[PDB]
Amino acid sequence: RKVLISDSLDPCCRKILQDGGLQVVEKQNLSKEELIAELQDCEGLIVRSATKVTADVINAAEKLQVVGRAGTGVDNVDLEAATRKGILVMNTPNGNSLSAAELTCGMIMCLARQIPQATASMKDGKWERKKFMGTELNGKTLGILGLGRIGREVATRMQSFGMKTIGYDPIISPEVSASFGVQQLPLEEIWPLCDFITVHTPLLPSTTGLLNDNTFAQCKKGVRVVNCARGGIVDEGALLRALQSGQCAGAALDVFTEEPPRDRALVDHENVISCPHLGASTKEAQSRCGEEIAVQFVDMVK
Amino acid sequence: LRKVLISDSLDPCCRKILQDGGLQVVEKQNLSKEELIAELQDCEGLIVRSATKVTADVINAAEKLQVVGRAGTGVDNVDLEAATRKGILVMNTPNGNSLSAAELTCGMIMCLARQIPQATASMKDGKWERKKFMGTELNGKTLGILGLGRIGREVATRMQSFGMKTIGYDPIISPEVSASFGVQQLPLEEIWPLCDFITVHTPLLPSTTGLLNDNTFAQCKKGVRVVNCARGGIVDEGALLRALQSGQCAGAALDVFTEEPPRDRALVDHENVISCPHLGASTKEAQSRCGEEIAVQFVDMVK
Numbered sequence: 001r002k003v004l005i006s007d008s009l010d011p012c013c014r015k016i017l018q019d020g021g022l023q024v025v026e027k028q029n030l031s032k033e034e035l036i037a038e039l040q041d042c043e044g045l046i047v048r049s050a051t052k053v054t055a056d057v058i059n060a061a062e063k064l065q066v067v068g069r070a071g072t073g074v075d076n077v078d079l080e081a082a083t084r085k086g087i088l089v090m091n092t093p094n095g096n097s098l099s100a101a102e103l104t105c106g107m108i109m110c111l112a113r114q115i116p117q118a119t120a121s122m123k124d125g126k127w128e129r130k131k132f133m134g135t136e137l138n139g140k141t142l143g144i145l146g147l148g149r150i151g152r153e154v155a156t157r158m159q160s161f162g163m164k165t166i167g168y169d170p171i172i173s174p175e176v177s178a179s180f181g182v183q184q185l186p187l188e189e190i191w192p193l194c195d196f197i198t199v200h201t202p203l204l205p206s207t208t209g210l211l212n213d214n215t216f217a218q219c220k221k222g223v224r225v226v227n228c229a230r231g232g233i234v235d236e237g238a239l240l241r242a243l244q245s246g247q248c249a250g251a252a253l254d255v256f257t258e259e260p261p262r263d264r265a266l267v268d269h270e271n272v273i274s275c276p277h278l279g280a281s282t283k284e285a286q287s288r289c290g291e292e293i294a295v296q297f298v299d300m301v302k
Numbered sequence: 303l304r305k306v307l308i309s310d311s312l313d314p315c316c317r318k319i320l321q322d323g324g325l326q327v328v329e330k331q332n333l334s335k336e337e338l339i340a341e342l343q344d345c346e347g348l349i350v351r352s353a354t355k356v357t358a359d360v361i362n363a364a365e366k367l368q369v370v371g372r373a374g375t376g377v378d379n380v381d382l383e384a385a386t387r388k389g390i391l392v393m394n395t396p397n398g399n400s401l402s403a404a405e406l407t408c409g410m411i412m413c414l415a416r417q418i419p420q421a422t423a424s425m426k427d428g429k430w431e432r433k434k435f436m437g438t439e440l441n442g443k444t445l446g447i448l449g450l451g452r453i454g455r456e457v458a459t460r461m462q463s464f465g466m467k468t469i470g471y472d473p474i475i476s477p478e479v480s481a482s483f484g485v486q487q488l489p490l491e492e493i494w495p496l497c498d499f500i501t502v503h504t505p506l507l508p509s510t511t512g513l514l515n516d517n518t519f520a521q522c523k524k525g526v527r528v529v530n531c532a533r534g535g536i537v538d539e540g541a542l543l544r545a546l547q548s549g550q551c552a553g554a555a556l557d558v559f560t561e562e563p564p565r566d567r568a569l570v571d572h573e574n575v576i577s578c579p580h581l582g583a584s585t586k587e588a589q590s591r592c593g594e595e596i597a598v599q600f601v602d603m604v605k
């Protein structure tokens with residue numbers, strides 16, 4: 001009967017909760033001990049990416065029955081510690097997909113034409129039309145690794161620019177991938193066909209370092225890569241050397257191993273487009289998330 | 303009618319198809335005015351990109367110059383008055399460009415929606431502000447396309463796939479044909495207030511110069527965003543500047559300027575302006591198609 005929203009979340013969350021009929025507490029940038037103390041009579045907790053629901057927090061929260069996350073994934077909640085105290089963890093699987101898919105297509109275009117590089121150049125007062133030569137997407141081959149919701153939204157968009165969408169996903173059948181115009185192949189057959197590769201998988205052991213020194217070497221010379229999913233699906237170290245060799249012509253990253261990143265080797269490279277994790281950074285999405293999570297809480301109050 | 307000079311960095315395949323046709327060629331680069339004239343003194347033809355400027359003076363010092371080709375669309379770097387006076391032919395390559403321009407345009411729109419160039423310049427400076435850079439979901443938003451030519455319809459079919467409403471205006475193409483690639487046509491006065499995004503794909507005309515001006519900008523939605531990848535001044539540079547400063551315009555993307563390169567560095571420098579040194583036709587894919595399509599035209603008239 002009492003929830004706490006611990007992060008900057010769309011107003012409409014708190015509304016639909018009270019609308020449902022339970023107390024709420026909008027707080028922000030709270031400290032670990034400040035959080036626990038506030039939590040000590042709250043049945044629910046909703047969080048964004050800021051709040052980290054550690055082992056310690058869950059065990060200091062004697063009343064905590066449920067932990068909702070207004071976003072995609074739960075990479076900021078101890079699931080081991082969660083399942084131990086029989087706690088529920090709630091998610092917002094739909095209401096974020098589109099925003100992430102768009103930023104991704106942004107990246108691909110931005111990579112093809114070096115728009116961010118040209119702006120930073122022009123902004124410094126330089127007219128370098130001698131050499132900023134980019135690529136026509138029409139008739140090029142894009143490789144999508146992770147034919148989830150985001151993966152298929154990215155595919156249908158970049159289809160319209162006349163790109164070949166070949167991809168790989170071990171859950172989805174060739175019959176269903178084909179049904180949104182992505183032809184499926186085994187990984188070893190994908191690397192050499194691609195001029196562009198984007199990744200849309202959760203961070204798993206089966207996925208970690210999916211692009212590494214070894215895959216990068218099987219790729220077309222001057223392939224270009226977009227990580228808007230999770231940090232490390234593309235091995236950060238590995239990419240760095242692929243850019244330095246020219247095996248990789250350029251790369252776009254919305255996500256890092258450390259967030260925010262200490263290893264500022266990549267960001268700083270002249271062929272790296274970067275963003276401080278903006279895949280869900282839209283009024284449109286956070287409202288749909290914030291709405292879809294607050295529903296799930298009220299839904300189970302019957 | 304039998305010896306040509308290529309004065310710019312042009313795709314190798316140009317010189318090939320020329321000699322292939324059966325006439326001498328001279329691939330030179332970054333030539334000086336007097337260095338050019340001297341080299342030209344036994345060349346019937348000249349092929350150029352955007353770099354070389356075929357001034358009044360050059361044409362009149364070139365007693366043998368019969369023809370001037372341009373590997374691109376437009377010839378805003380050749381004195382046409384001085385050209386027609388000496389009975390010289392001027393050729394260009396209007397086709398081999400459309401797609402490259404359409405893509406950069408969609409680039410701009412996304413880049414504007416999500417501030418990708420701003421985020422890179424920020425990250426590149428070592429900054430993580432995710433609380434700051436809230437952008438827009440294109441899904442269900444309205445794009446206004448002014449100039450439903452080739453480029454205009456390629457831009458429309460692409461941004462449709464993101465789930466945008468494509469309303470546009472073009473006085474040449476009928477509502478019946480615009481509708482047939484998913485652009486609903488409306489009179490200009492009724493377009494400004496519906497748009498969250500406006501791009502322009504028209505030639506430079508007096509009827510189109512300053513198409514976006516203090517007056518149109520004011521009838522737009524507060525925080526509209528604008529893309530000029532067509533010609534400098536279709537969007538009044540001065541007018542835009544004040545629209546960004548007021549917030550009537552939330553941001554702008556420019557591939558084209560009144561002066562190229564631009565002296566008035568007021569716009570470029572604004573924090574919500576994405577800018578490019580005229581890269582709409584800056585793709586290996588296009589310059590080859592241009593370079594190929596021009597060398598054809600030269601050989602075609604040799605028989």
Ligand SMILES: Cn1c(C(=O)NC2(c3ccc([C@H](C(=O)O)c4cccnc4)cc3)COC2)cc2c(Cl)c(Cl)ccc21
Pocket residue numbers: 072073093097145146147148149150151168169170171172199200201202203204206207210229230
């Ligand atoms: C488990 N797994 C998946 C996978 O999880 N695929 C499915 C999937 C479902 C939902 C998503 C999410 C989504 O699209 O909503 C998603 C996208 C991007 C980042 N994080 C989450 C992603 C993938 C399709 O049914 C499940 C792809 C995948 C790949 Cl490409 C490899 Cl190589 C290894 C393991 C993999």
Ligand SMILES: Cn1c(C(=O)NC2(c3ccc([C@H](C(=O)O)c4cccnc4)cc3)COC2)cc2c(Cl)c(Cl)ccc21
Pocket residue numbers: 400448449450451452453454471472473474475503504505506507509510513532533
């Ligand atoms: C002459 N004219 C046209 C016009 O020429 N429209 C058509 C057109 C055809 C071809 C183009 C060209 C093209 O799309 O390739 C073009 C685009 C951008 C820059 N330079 C040339 C532009 C427009 C559509 O069928 C012809 C639109 C137009 C408009 Cl919207 C105004 Cl407001 C004033 C005069 C105008």
